[PDB]
Amino acid sequence: SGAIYVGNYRVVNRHLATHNDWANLVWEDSSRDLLVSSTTAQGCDTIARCDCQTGVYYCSSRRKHYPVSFSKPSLIFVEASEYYPARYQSHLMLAVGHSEPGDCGGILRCQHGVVGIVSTGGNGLVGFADVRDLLWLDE
Ligand SMILES: CSc1ccc(C2CC2)cc1CC(=O)N1CCC[C@H](C(N)=O)C1
Ligand SMILES: [Zn+2]
């Protein structure tokens, strides 16, 4: 679990979305595993506008923050699961680091702010759903 709260938006994994999120849908994308919904309260997370390749992510399965070197956003194949069939997930960034299924939603941050959220993982790797390109989150 985990979400990004910027202004009047809530950014979560599309596969972990709730009824409120779908009843107040702004935008959703299965290939990115992102869903953005409406909120009345004014969130304060700063989204990064950058091309950083080093950051810090939160791992709830270890109760720790970890520094990671991560890849550039790309179409990386994700094996079929209970939420999605086998496919390439766009805007995904990989890193060598610990990851477990309940880790989805954990924030990734650099000096510029929020980069993305834990979306995939396994075999000693962790994948992040990038949000730096969603310029409408601030406006
Ligand atoms: C941090 S999630 C994770 C971590 C470790 C593992 C274990 C080492 C295998 C597996 C996973 C699950 C996984 O990657 N997905 C299931 C939920 C939907 C995700 C998607 N965005 O398509 C894909
Ligand atoms: Zn940055």
From Swiss-Prot:
Q: Which reaction does it catalyse?
A: Selective cleavage of Tyr-|-Gly bond in the picornavirus polyprotein
Which residues does the Swiss-Prot or TrEMBL record annotate as the active site?
Answer: 15, 33, 104
Signal sequence: where?
Answer: none
- Tell me where on the tree of life, at the top rank, the source sits: Viruses
Q: Where does Zn(2+) 1 bind?
A: 50, 52, 110, 112
Q: How does it assemble?
A: Homodimer.
Role description: Cysteine protease that cleaves viral polyprotein and specific host proteins. It is responsible for the autocatalytic cleavage between the P1 and P2 regions, which is the first cleavage occurring in the polyprotein. Also cleaves the host translation initiation factor EIF4G1, in order to shut down the capped cellular mRNA translation. Inhibits the host nucleus-cytoplasm protein and RNA trafficking by cleaving host members of the nuclear pores. Counteracts stress granule formation probably by antagonizing its assembly or promoting its dissassembly.
Q: What is this protein called?
A: Protease 2A
Q: Which organism is it from?
A: Coxsackievirus A16 (strain G-10)
Residues of the whole record sequence present? 869 to 1007 of 2193
